[PDB]
Design a protein around this ligand. Sequence first.
Ligand SMILES: *[C@@H]1O[C@H](CO)[C@@H](O)[C@H](O)[C@H]1NC(C)=O
Ligand SMILES: *[C@@H]1O[C@H](CO)[C@@H](O)[C@H](O)[C@H]1NC(C)=O
Ligand SMILES: *[C@@H]1O[C@H](CO)[C@@H](O)[C@H](O)[C@H]1NC(C)=O
Ligand SMILES: *[C@@H]1O[C@H](CO)[C@@H](O)[C@H](O)[C@H]1NC(C)=O
Ligand SMILES: *[C@@H]1O[C@H](CO)[C@@H](O)[C@H](O)[C@H]1NC(C)=O
Ligand SMILES: [Cl-]
Ligand SMILES: [Cl-]
Ligand SMILES: [Cl-]
Ligand SMILES: [Cl-]
Ligand SMILES: [Cl-]
Ligand SMILES: [Cl-]
Ligand SMILES: [Cl-]
Ligand SMILES: [Cl-]
Ligand SMILES: [Cl-]
Ligand SMILES: [Cl-]
Ligand SMILES: [Cl-]
Ligand SMILES: [Cl-]
Ligand SMILES: [Cl-]
Ligand SMILES: [Cl-]
Lengths: 106, 105, 104, 98, 106, 101, 150, 147, 150, 142, 149, 138
Amino acid sequence: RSLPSCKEDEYPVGSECCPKCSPGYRVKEACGELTGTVCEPCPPGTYIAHLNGLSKCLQCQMCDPAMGLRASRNCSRTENAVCGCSPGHFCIVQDGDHCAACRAYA
Amino acid sequence: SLPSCKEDEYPVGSECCPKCSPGYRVKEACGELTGTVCEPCPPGTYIAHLNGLSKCLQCQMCDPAMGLRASRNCSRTENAVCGCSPGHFCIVQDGDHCAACRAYA
Amino acid sequence: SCKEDEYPVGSECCPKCSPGYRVKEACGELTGTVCEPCPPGTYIAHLNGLSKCLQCQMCDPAMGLRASRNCSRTENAVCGCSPGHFCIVQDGDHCAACRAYATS
Amino acid sequence: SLPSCKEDEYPVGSECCPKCSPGYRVKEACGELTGTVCEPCPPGTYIAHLNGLSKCLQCQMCDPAMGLRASRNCSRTENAVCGCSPGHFCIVCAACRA
Amino acid sequence: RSLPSCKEDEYPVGSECCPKCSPGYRVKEACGELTGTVCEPCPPGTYIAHLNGLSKCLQCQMCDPAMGLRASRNCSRTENAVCGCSPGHFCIVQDGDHCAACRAYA
Amino acid sequence: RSLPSCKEDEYPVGSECCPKCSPGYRVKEACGELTGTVCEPCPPGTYIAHLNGLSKCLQCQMCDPAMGLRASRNCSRTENAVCGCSPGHFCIVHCAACRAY
Amino acid sequence: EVNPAAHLTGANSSLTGSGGPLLWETQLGLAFLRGLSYHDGALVVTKAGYYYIYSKVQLGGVGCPLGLASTITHGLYKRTPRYPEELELLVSQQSPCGRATSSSRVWWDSSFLGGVVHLEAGEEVVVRVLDERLVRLRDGTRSYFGAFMV
Amino acid sequence: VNPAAHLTGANSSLTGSGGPLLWETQLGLAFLRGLSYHDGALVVTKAGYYYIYSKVQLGGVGCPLASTITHGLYKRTPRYPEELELLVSQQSPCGRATSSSRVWWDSSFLGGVVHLEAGEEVVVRVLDERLVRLRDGTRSYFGAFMV
Amino acid sequence: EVNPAAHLTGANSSLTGSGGPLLWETQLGLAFLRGLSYHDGALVVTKAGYYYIYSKVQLGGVGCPLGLASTITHGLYKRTPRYPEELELLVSQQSPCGRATSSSRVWWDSSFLGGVVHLEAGEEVVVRVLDERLVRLRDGTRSYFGAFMV
Amino acid sequence: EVNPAAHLTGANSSLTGSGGPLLWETQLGLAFLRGLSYHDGALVVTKAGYYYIYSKVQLGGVGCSTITHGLYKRTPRYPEELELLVSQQSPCTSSSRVWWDSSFLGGVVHLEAGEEVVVRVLDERLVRLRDGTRSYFGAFMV
Amino acid sequence: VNPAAHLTGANSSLTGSGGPLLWETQLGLAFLRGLSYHDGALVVTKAGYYYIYSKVQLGGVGCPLGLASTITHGLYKRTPRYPEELELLVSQQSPCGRATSSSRVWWDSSFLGGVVHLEAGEEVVVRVLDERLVRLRDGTRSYFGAFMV
Amino acid sequence: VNPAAHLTGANSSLTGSGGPLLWETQLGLAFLRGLSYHDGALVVTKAGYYYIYSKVQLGGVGCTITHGLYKRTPRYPEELELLVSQQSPCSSRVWWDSSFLGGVVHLEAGEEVVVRVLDERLVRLRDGTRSYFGAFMV
Ligand SMILES: *[C@@H]1O[C@H](CO)[C@@H](O)[C@H](O)[C@H]1NC(C)=O
Ligand SMILES: *[C@@H]1O[C@H](CO)[C@@H](O)[C@H](O)[C@H]1NC(C)=O
Ligand SMILES: *[C@@H]1O[C@H](CO)[C@@H](O)[C@H](O)[C@H]1NC(C)=O
Ligand SMILES: *[C@@H]1O[C@H](CO)[C@@H](O)[C@H](O)[C@H]1NC(C)=O
Ligand SMILES: *[C@@H]1O[C@H](CO)[C@@H](O)[C@H](O)[C@H]1NC(C)=O
Ligand SMILES: [Cl-]
Ligand SMILES: [Cl-]
Ligand SMILES: [Cl-]
Ligand SMILES: [Cl-]
Ligand SMILES: [Cl-]
Ligand SMILES: [Cl-]
Ligand SMILES: [Cl-]
Ligand SMILES: [Cl-]
Ligand SMILES: [Cl-]
Ligand SMILES: [Cl-]
Ligand SMILES: [Cl-]
Ligand SMILES: [Cl-]
Ligand SMILES: [Cl-]
Ligand SMILES: [Cl-]
């Protein structure tokens, strides 16, 4: 038992669905009866990775050099940053499928 | 990158055809006049997103010999999820979820 | 001012419910304390004026514990060691944890 | 059953071809030309002997997580060799505990 | 070329300035257009070490004997207690100004 | 309604049936309209224990001394080696392995 | 007039092991809902606004569970139909036991978080703990999840 | 006026007597606004739902009785003859310390919303009480406000 | 009659290393201000009264600068023109490496505090941690600083 | 010129416990048959020739002797199954400890039309089925 | 020309990023014949059935801290037909634990192969759950390949 | 005809001489089709890309194995490692473990591939079904 919902490409505004914004953009203004959804791109240091109805982009994660990490991919509008070992370091602590701390070679 | 289809489409040859809903696989690809023909995933299988797949994803089984049962059954749009059998508690973890339970002594 | 078997509700002194029973409706000047039994998994051990029963504790098998006394409407559950386990930390009458006997 | 070529050549089809010096691979095999053309191994590879190889051999990497560093670097004529990092001792060199 | 401000011995009250109270005293009533700041002494157990416009005094710190500590200086209305080691104890960690914990001599 | 089939002592060749070969022999050449199944003995190291239509014999098993095993019965063209413990050795796990006292 | 509030308590079914959120008791004992509702582990907002949300989980164990990750999270998450993934709101990362922890003694550690977040109507908040084997349920007083509009 | 209180750890704060912690109600940061206090307890005057909270600072110069600490909030009500547990935490700092003789510190925080009738009381307890490290009222404290 | 509230989130600017307080994000992601302001790390009160203030800081590291000697202080402090010094409000001490060994160096721990305090118009609250090197910033969900009027 | 190929996947009916071979899924998901057939666990050859055959089985359990994992030919030319490619593995402990271990075998064998290949594992209870990706059986003509 | 490839372990193979392993494509034993490569993936040009395979060498001194109870090595498809990777062939291993003597070297090699259907533009990648277990050498011990059948 | 071969462990398979493993080429399941054999080596005739494979059954009664495929070529005076695995085998218990590898390599006419196992004593030969070595062109 679920309630009726919007499509995988839409999102609720009041009692109706509006179209979702593309990855990399957030909602600036909702549908009216005769206005499309107005999307605006994510500001620096934020991202949204999927189609969305979010009013605020998601904050990108920082990669901490003090933990031996650097970004192996930089934050972009559509994608969070991802962390890897700094040069001269190897991974010594794992968090699920990815590295969380690296150690400097002796 | 390369030129790509919109989110609700997938590539057929050098063109793009509309995707099928969650729970449905592609039975027949779209032509110019004719839309995508879709068909529901058979029992034991699922597809959770808009998709252009010809074959559904197989649902996982929850192994009672590992002290588990489905806490959520397989359905057309969703995989089964495993939890402890009654009278068992979680002893092994795989990431965020339980991989084995032990019977009470 | 309320005696032993009563308790204060607004301006009134109301009769208490028995063990195993909760106050569903407080007494008014004109209508009595309405007592209802605690539902399963809860208890109240004394004469009381509680609107809600106390939740019974669960004995944790992962700590080597089982119920040596089940929860009833008047009594909390008590925990002791599971079979093949012995106490390593003791509380009042029960354990807080048991470990298993090693084997060869 | 005899080799196709004398020791200092190698077979390439019907023909027997001159070899290439250590650090060099065969860029252009003998054929119409009686002779071989050799070119340097690219970085990260080596070849240690007279050869008729079209591709150089990959240098090994010395694994820091195993307590190893290169005591001899990889060059075109020689593979890297691994030995302990500072403060470690060989346990097997293939691994080094501190 | 600065901007005007309360004097060191005054503090803000709306867009006005009122005189501060003395050490060991707190404000009981603010100053008014005729009236001065009304000050009252800090009750025991508390202090204020400087000219202030505080409504409440500051709580004196206790020196914890279980931490091998004792007062070098009792609290007073104008000064906080200072803690140092008890007889038969040496300081094992400083906290900058003062000592945080002491151990016996066996 | 059962279905037709080679006899017990014959084996399928194409759409037809040829006689099997004796234990210890393999089919060198399939039977023909005028010619019998041509069979030939299994070379040493191999066996076949039953009538058969095999083009190759089964390889005999070796009994591994290093596992404390000897042949109790040697391999032959018609039966496989069988392993048991060597002298000064008793079975742990046919025995798949044996210990020295 | 009625300010939305709730307090939800650990219960026999709180730890599903399914990779899903914790579940909670909503009616018995100390649990209540006032102007919020509950659905599969979530507080469901009916009146939009800013809410202080909080959760406590009691951790502990005899020794340390096998295969335990180095890092464990206890966090509050938002579910919204505006995004097909949960949004992290408030999260703590802890390393409560490991290799060096003695197999034989009992340890206890409690994790509390709180904070104010903005929630629309129909949005939800859930609690997750990465490895539920560390959660020590008792009687609803050691692990819980609540909120109130501010 | 919405009731609220913040009470600070006190010279008196530990009776040692099997009674609850004691708190300061007027000096410094401490205050009562539309709640009362009596023998360690916040005493409710206006019935309703309250967020209650407490922080206690634990610590020691090494570790000598019980390795397990309980820090709790509890209700005293004429409706029941025992105190009822509301919100409780357990901590183990000495049990798992790598050195028995090191100085250590650990802070225990809890809060939550509970329903309280007029005349009902909330107290704070810690066992063993000797792990509580008092200073100046900034590290151990006890408060509430109606929500 | 809007009730003042705020939630500010750990940021890339968050740790000055200047011996000044932590700074915080105010506008992006989950951060917001309602009827409060911000100044140089400080929540600045407009409307006088009693505020529940709170902060969480996420700590962690690969070993500690001082071994088993390492101590952390995490606090909330008032800055007021009525006094020329910052005043301690709510403070915690932790021994973050206390369970660590050389072969178990990597650790994580969160510190949370909250409490109700009186703030006049123009007064400020800031968060300070010593030693800032143990603060592990991520994406604003692990360290944060907030308040609301009660 | 269509090259026979197949890949068959672990299924909930895979472990019959009857002493017979494992069974497999042939159509759904990642499973298919191209110029080969299937019958009661067996890949059945239509086109005679040399096939690379392969199987993976995922083994594992919580706590707990020898496991055997094999591919076998059934042929009308002999009243018994012929062992083709076989592996032995030791199982397994804390009885609170999970272990896992995958067994892979592959090789090229000659198969006539109408001959069959099956997979067997002893003891079947140590096989950990999941979703068709962990235990599988296939072949192609080379 | 039948598509075929063998890619080999390299110094950039282990990114620690939660992405797939990366591979050498040109040097030494590595090559591409009628298949392409992109960010770790073998990219298919000619649609059909492919035997795909991978070997990863695991090993260590001791066991990495916080190692999970279940480690996977697998082959996964990326396709524009679905927004997630699809698992094709995966193994679960439990290579070492907290009991493992931190005073000695263990090794264990994981191999898998199978036939899958791939369309033009689909991609296969290799993942290992915990890259700290993977002992790169010179391309002979960890690798990833495919050929059309 | 597409070259292919499958060779089976046999009584002579372990020389104990520091040379490669030897194998059976004609009996039982063994065969050669467009490949030849020479002292343990599969010998290529038609040049191109081959999937090569080998399985070795390891085992013992109580107690680092390397198992490898190698190229011999007059293009270089040492064997070249192609595909290699390391395994930690092993007090007083019986154990078994099987090592499998495969991969695609380029082989020229006249070039050879062999299989080595160190320590050879750990190989448990049985009847050719458990240790083998093969290849086919792709
Ligand atoms: C990310 O950003 C910095 C500049 O801020 C640049 O130097 C660096 O190379 C970039 N890293 C990657 C992986 O692209
Ligand atoms: C999943 O399926 C089984 C079989 O029909 C059903 O009986 C069971 O109720 C389901 N489990 C749950 C939790 O719904
Ligand atoms: C407690 O109740 C359970 C539930 O039926 C029962 O099975 C168990 O034996 C009881 N234990 C005792 C000690 O009475
Ligand atoms: C503080 O007061 C006590 C008793 O009133 C006295 O004995 C003590 O010496 C005083 N300490 C100092 C340092 O002045
Ligand atoms: C089997 O054959 C061997 C080798 O010729 C011989 O020495 C031995 O005595 C025979 N043993 C048995 C049991 O047949
Ligand atoms: Cl939003
Ligand atoms: Cl598909
Ligand atoms: Cl399907
Ligand atoms: Cl009540
Ligand atoms: Cl109740
Ligand atoms: Cl070459
Ligand atoms: Cl005061
Ligand atoms: Cl045959
Ligand atoms: Cl609880
Ligand atoms: Cl204090
Ligand atoms: Cl953060
Ligand atoms: Cl499976
Ligand atoms: Cl490698
Ligand atoms: Cl064999």
